[PDB]
């Protein structure tokens, strides 16, 4: 064989190279494996075709197998190794040609332990991360979340009672404490919010891939066991005049909840199965949204980036059809503008 000239031949060579590594995650050569995975991630993101069999071969031999090993708390491995694996999964599922072979992924995943152990890890988190924050809590859900974008795998989680494990977990008591907020001096509460906003809620939006005829009483019951959050989500976006700033995640949380409560309501009018009502004042949200839409100046002043990624497109700019000055504002505008459409 010659040198790789195609992006697919590069993918073959990198993947052929990953399998060659005798003992991954071993104290010696764990660091070399770490950058191989990073090379894989670059190539996979590079697969915009700017071939699909390799990606499916990668999902078993690389992604599934590695997570199985990551339950090692005996070993030079870190949370960021899991995050790297979660990342490689995203790159795989973004490649053109995938999403037609979802049962394939379902097949591949279910073969290993995976979501069973991913769920296990979620119920573990606090005993395994009270350095300050349940770091493995968010990592587990984000793994599940990425998979839940595939409707078939979404059905498996609910059938295996993921929503049951979510509320029964020890974590459910920490998220329930009234200190959970994106702007906390506490590391735990800050991660608790991350698990709920960036994990639980987008999970629920996807689990309703089974049309919400079923699971709707279960998704409504999940939300119903975090009322301090349903209450906080509205108060956080309150027009200026115990909250100083406003985050982008706060807008997506409310965006998620607005979709859930509306879809649930369009399923409650079915009058055919008991879908519990969820206490979430839509009225306050709408008004809060309008008095942030009509004030781009006071918006960009109070709006703060929380992630190094979000800060990138904060100092950036994207005018086009201009109602915003910076790109971060545009994304901020985009979110709460959709919340207006939904609740209407």
UniProtKB/TrEMBL annotation:
Signal peptide: none annotated. Belongs to the Nup188 family. Residues 10-343 form the Nuclear pore protein Nup188 C-terminal domain. It comes from Thermothelomyces thermophilus (strain ATCC 42464 / BCRC 31852 / DSM 1799). It is found in: Nucleus, Nuclear pore complex. It comes from the Eukaryota. The chain holds residues 1445 to 1823 of 1827 of the full protein. This is Nucleoporin NUP188.
């Amino acid at each position: 064989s010659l040198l790789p000239k195609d992006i697919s031949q590069l993918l073959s060579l990198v993947s052929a190279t990953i399998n060659g590594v005798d003992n991954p995650w071993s104290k010696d050569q764990i660091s070399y494996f770490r950058t191989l995975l990073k090379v894989l991630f670059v190539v996979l993101r590079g697969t915009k075709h700017s071939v699909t069999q390799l990606v499916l071969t990668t999902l078993d031999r690389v992604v599934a197998r590695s997570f199985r090993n990551l339950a090692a708390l005996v070993a030079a491995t870190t949370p960021e190794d899991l995050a790297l694996i979660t990342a490689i999964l995203q790159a795989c599922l973004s490649v053109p040609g995938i999403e037609q072979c979802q049962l394939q992924v379902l097949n591949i995943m279910s073969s290993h332990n995976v979501l069973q152990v991913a769920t296990s890890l979620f119920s573990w988190s606090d005993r395994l991360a009270e350095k300050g924050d349940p770091i493995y809590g968010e990592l587990a859900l984000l793994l599940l979340l990425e998979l839940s974008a595939l409707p078939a795998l979404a059905e498996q989680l609910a059938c295996d009672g993921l929503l049951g494990h979510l509320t029964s977990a020890n974590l459910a008591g920490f998220m329930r404490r009234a200190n959970v907020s994106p702007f906390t001096d506490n590391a735990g509460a800050a991660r608790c919010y991350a698990i709920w906003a960036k994990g639980i809620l987008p999970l629920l939006l996807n689990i309703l891939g089974a049309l919400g005829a079923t699971i709707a009483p279960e998704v409504a019951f999940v939300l119903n066991q975090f009322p301090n959050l349903l209450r906080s989500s509205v108060d956080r976006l309150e027009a200026p005049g115990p909250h100083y700033f406003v985050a982008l995640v706060a807008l997506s949380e409310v965006h998620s909840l607005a979709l859930l409560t509306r879809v649930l309501a369009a399923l409650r009018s079915g009058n055919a199965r008991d879908i519990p009502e969820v206490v979430w004042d839509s009225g306050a949200v709408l008004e809060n949204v309008e008095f942030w839409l009509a004030s781009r100046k006071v918006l960009r002043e109070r709006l703060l980036p929380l992630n190094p990624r979000e800060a990138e497109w904060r100092g950036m700019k994207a005018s086009e059809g201009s109602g915003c000055e910076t790109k971060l504002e545009e994304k901020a505008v985009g979110l709460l503008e959709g919340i207006r459409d939904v609740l209407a």
